[PDB]
Ligand SMILES: CCCCCCSC[C@H](NC(=O)CC[C@H]([NH3+])C(=O)O)C(=O)NCC(=O)O
């Protein structure tokens with residue numbers, strides 16, 4: 001509710017988008033406190049002294065940091081709402097694994113596109129994203145088993161872990177002039193991304209690619 | 223059994239030690255298959271094709287990769303045994319956060335001492351480990367609340383997440399000549415470490431410092 005739950009956030013952040021989507025799924029009302037480029041709110045400094053990063057969930061004045069730890073907490077606390085993590089332990093392990101792979105391997109390689117110097121090191125980095133996308137496409141096929149989401153009939157953990165990145169992937173496409181996810185290259189993921197973005201829990205916190213692209217260059221600021 | 227549970231590991235690995243300790247806590251018997259430097263077993267290649275890393279837990283021919291995911295899996299599957307994660311959602315979010323801290327910041331920072339070239343960029347790195355350790359000492363105090371472990375009366379998630387590194391910490395002290403965890407700089411951690419290494423789930427899978435230091439030598443395949 002607006003009282004007991006605050007989210008420290010910033011609308012362009014994929015990591016923060018993970019928390020908002022998960023709160024929506026649970027039908028948890030909350031207060032959204034937005035950070036600004038170039039400064040830190042006193043409440044952030046207080047709540048996340050170790051990392052000073054967003055998102056931070058503040059529940060009855062108790063802070064929870066790190067997006068995936070926050071998703072887990074919302075799922076373990078509001079455990080009577082719709083399940084975010086899969087029911088079965090083995091399936092939970094698979095889902096955690098692929099979320100960890102996205103933060104460790106995939107998203108860093110996405111950013112390494114806007115970071116490569118030379119038209120060789122760029123194309124090499126493009127090949128790495130495409131390849132990891134093929135892994136992700138196959139994973140979705142094996143996990144979803146004909147159902148709309150990674151988590152089956154309903155958006156789950158992995159949906160949220162990967163889906164949060166859709167805005168920045170679409171931005172990365174336009175600026176690199178490379179399409180990564182579409183009907184032709186990744187037919188299952190393309191169908192999945194349509195469902196995910198139109199889901200009610202997602203629809204209103206997933207930013208238009210147009211806005212996000214412009215903030216992307218507002219972040220042209222060394 | 224020694225049949226139904228296989229662990230692909232290697233005795234010098236602190237990440238493998240995580241899985242071994244958790245299995246012992248649950249009293250789960252398992253087969254231990256050891257990797258060797260410069261090779262990958264066929265069974266590892268088919269079980270962790272994405273990362274080709276150990277540990278890998280194979281449960282009834284089903285592979286689970288990544289040490290903290292493995293620990294979660296063991297705690298969630300053998301859910302009638304002694305609990306590894308805390309019971310409370312908030313405490314569990316805090317125990318996850320510090321384990322995540324250790325793998326993101328502390329441990330690479332520990333390794334960045336050995337890899338530091340130039341007497342003083344080394345000093346910078348040495349100060350980073352001591353800063354990090356003061357944080358963990360204070361965290362141990364606030365979290366144990368006078369109990370012997372991070373986990374209370376019994377060893378817990380965070381005990382395992384951190385203590386798995388004790389052997390390599392010692393090696394790092396030996397080689398760098400610096401004293402990091404001890405009665406003067408980290409009094410509580412110093413007593414805890416002795417308690418931890420004494421635990422039955424721990425004492426047989428934690429390698430002797432000198433043995434480990436010699437393997438660190440053999441780790442001269444450049
Ligand atoms: C900036 C928006 C777009 C760039 C992508 C990063 S999103 C926001 C970013 N958040 C983080 O890096 C925290 C990640 C954290 N490991 C988590 O998963 O929760 C941030 O600004 N954290 C504060 C900081 O980096 O200091």
Ligand SMILES: CCCCCCSC[C@H](NC(=O)CC[C@H]([NH3+])C(=O)O)C(=O)NCC(=O)O
Nearest residue numbers: 234235236237274275276277287288289290
């Ligand atoms: C060797 C002891 C020094 C400690 C660092 C490396 S331990 C062994 C190393 N394991 C990992 O990197 C596991 C990382 C994984 N995140 C996990 O937590 O399990 C490995 O796979 N080794 C084989 C490989 O990476 O190819």
